[PDB]
Design a protein around this ligand. Sequence first.
Ligand SMILES: CN(Cc1ccco1)C(=O)c1cc(-c2n[nH]c(=O)n2-c2ccccc2F)c(O)cc1O
Length: 208
Amino acid sequence: AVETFAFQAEIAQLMSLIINTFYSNKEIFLRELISNSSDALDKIRYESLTDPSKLDSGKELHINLIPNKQDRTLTIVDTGIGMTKADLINNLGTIAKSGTKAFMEALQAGADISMIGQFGVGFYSAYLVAEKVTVITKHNDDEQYAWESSAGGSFTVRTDTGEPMGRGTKVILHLKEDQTEYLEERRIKEIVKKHSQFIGYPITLFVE
Ligand SMILES: CN(Cc1ccco1)C(=O)c1cc(-c2n[nH]c(=O)n2-c2ccccc2F)c(O)cc1O
């Protein structure tokens, strides 16, 4: 049921740098995840213009932010296009290669970690605040999958046996013990207002 994969070497190196570099401006992770969700929503909306049946798995196009102080998790849910098994295992990592290599050269040349998004590898900034990331996804052309990594050079993929989601992606950030400020309603609002006022889909913050 569970398959284990090695990350592409350059991605493993980037994740180690993100985990081991002293860097205080950690809030940039939320902008990057919301941006990816917005891109996934644009993709399904676009495909639905030539094939309306693409929305049979759900018409609502939105992003939900769900902090959970008890489990110490921050969940980002979207009803975008989702990802196939091939996306999770190889295809997204393949397209990220040049950006990953360029970003690491930029960091060696004195660039700031906040520039990560300009290199298309913004997702990995989640490892500034998360000890583990679980991703539950469902694409119209494939089954529901659960991807997971605590970094350390590998990730896993399994078919998800949990509640079916219809379509989209759920990113569950298992936060580090000293990063619980990202579970506070006022902190999430401050970040979203500062880094995300040009997203064309409703972002709803779930109150505990
Ligand atoms: C969950 N991850 C990290 C990861 C671990 C394994 C594979 O990806 C993400 O980056 C991520 C991906 C999507 C997504 N669904 N469909 C699709 O095309 N994308 C996508 C959109 C913009 C850039 C890249 C993308 F893939 C999303 O909606 C939210 C996300 O936070």
